[PDB]
């Protein structure tokens, strides 16, 4: 995260850390949507152009964490993946559309003060919350700057405003799609901030003023640098892909 601040303890209990076995390193962010299901970005574990394809066995998920490196026993909870299900429509070639993956946990993770699942928006909720002008919350252990400590000591957080499609689109030569939205501050607003290397897969969340609950409206996908003036972070439009998520959940359960 860029231009963010330290997350409070139990501020983002659904936050998940995608950790690689060997070597031992941070891979991406991710979110906990239930007892055994974790959500993340596709490209975090499938990118041919770099020869990257991990497997349930290459990977580990760390839940309830706060520190980026310290081992938090009795707090965090590491779990393994029974299976990986990434979206077949995942356009890894040109624009990274459908940047999304599920990952099932071999054993159901127990909930506590540091581990709780986030809600997924329904038609009405997605319609009510996902609008240009509203702000969302981004979180991750990604780098503090695009170019330049560099890595955060503890989970980072930042709030960003959802941007107008026409604007997002006239911001990059890349071919946007209805499956992705972009957020971030315009150059003439003062406040800045963005996701960055390592933040991918992380959740973009919003809180319902109606029922006091938190919803994941996006997945950190891609951007042209970090905290660039005139640039914006692009996030996977979750709901617009909820059908697939339901199919997999019930089918490959």
């Amino acid at each position: 995260i860029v231009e963010g601040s330290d997350a409070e303890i139990g501020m983002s209990p659904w936050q998940v850390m995608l950790f690689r076995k060997s070597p031992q390193e941070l891979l991406c962010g991710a979110s906990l949507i239930s007892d055994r299901w974790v959500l993340t970005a596709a490209h975090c574990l499938l990118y041919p152009p770099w020869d990257k394809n991990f497997t349930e066995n290459d990977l580990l998920v760390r839940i309830g964490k706060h520190s980026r490196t310290r081992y938090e026993r009795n707090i965090e909870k590491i779990s393994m993946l029974e299976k990986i299900y990434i979206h077949p429509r995942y356009n890894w070639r040109e624009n990274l559309d459908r940047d999304i993956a599920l990952m099932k946990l071999k054993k159901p993770v127990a909930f506590s003060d540091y581990i709780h699942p986030v809600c997924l928006p329904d038609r009405e909720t997605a319609a009510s919350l996902l609008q240009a002008g509203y702000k969302g919350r981004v979180t991750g252990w990604g780098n503090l700057k695009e170019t330049w400590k560099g890595q955060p000591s503890v989970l980072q957080v930042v709030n960003l405003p959802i941007v107008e499609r026409p604007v997002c689109k006239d911001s990059t030569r890349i071919r946007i799609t209805d499956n992705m939205f972009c957020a971030g501050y315009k150059p003439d607003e003062g406040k800045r901030g963005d996701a960055c290397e390592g933040d991918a897969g992380g959740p973009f969340v919003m809180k319902s003023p109606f029922n006091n609950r938190w919803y994941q409206m996006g997945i950190v996908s891609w951007g042209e640098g970090c905290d660039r003036d005139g640039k914006y972070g692009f996030y996977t439009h979750v709901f617009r892909l909820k059908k697939w998520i339901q199919k997999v959940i019930d089918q490959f359960g």
Binding site: P49, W50, E94, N95, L96, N143, K145, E146, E197, C226
Partner: protein, 377 residues
Amino acid sequence: FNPLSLEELGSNTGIQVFNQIVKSRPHDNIVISPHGIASVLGMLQLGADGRTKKQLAMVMRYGVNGVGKILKKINKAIVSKKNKDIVTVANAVFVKNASEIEVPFVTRNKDVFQCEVRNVNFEDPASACDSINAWVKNETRDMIDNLLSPDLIDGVLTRLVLVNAVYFKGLWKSRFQPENTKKRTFVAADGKSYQVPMLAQLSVFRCGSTSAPNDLWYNFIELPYHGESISMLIALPTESSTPLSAIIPHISTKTIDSWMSIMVPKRVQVILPKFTAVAQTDLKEPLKVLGITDMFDSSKANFAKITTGSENLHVSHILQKAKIEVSEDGTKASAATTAILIARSSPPWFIVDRPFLFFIRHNPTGAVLFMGQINKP
């Protein structure tokens, strides 16, 4: 044995020749085809006998006979249109006109080394030079064309002329974008810095680095060609205060292999000078050092399997001309698409702004097609 271990022997010989030339001219640009040299020695060995053949055999470490097949297969694969990238190679041996050449010599040469052997009246210098310079121009698609002058091939005192020419310029698996090709500072040998055009690209390349027997460190990167069989290797001293001459002598095919088992992929800003290297080499003196002195002796040279009669035949001129161009042209943007995006954060650099040596390597065979040092692009 293994056609790989054999190619190893050939390439080694060429490299040893490279080391020789390099030490005698440290600050100059030198491009050689190690494998090409092995082919020339083969061409020669085919029609040589007695002491002459004995010398060639003990240097090459292998005898043309009983191996030709292995040598023909490798020499065929290298040029094979299956590489997608085309390596033009010309091989010719010219013999005095007033001498009847043998049939099996001509036949075998064209068969194993794709070499054209034929007569030419050296009695007339200008006529021979044009005749030869014209064959190279044709055999290399106008790529190379100026091996001999008129003041070189002179009189009937010139009996035998060997020639090997190699040209190359494949297509990068990851083309450079001209928009990103700007002039960057290059520090030459003398110490002076020059402003020189340089290719620049952000992508994943195999990298690495180790120390020489003298504990001096150098880096090396692999730049594969869209063909997927021929790749370019670049190595240069890690410390700016380290002379290239301090790493060269410690490099054999054996070390080139280590490179292959050591290098790992990593996202990098690879910046290397855009240049076109072309050098002509006289292999006479270097080859003498290796122990091959007979064939250069008007009387001692024994080439019986070359001539129908017992005429005295010796090597008057043995030459190689290698040409390579490094440019932007290559395959395009499919992995280049999003690959441009995931560069979320400036990556490390592989900047070649100091005298460096390069390799063109045919992976399947292990054949080292090119070996060069660039002191000033």
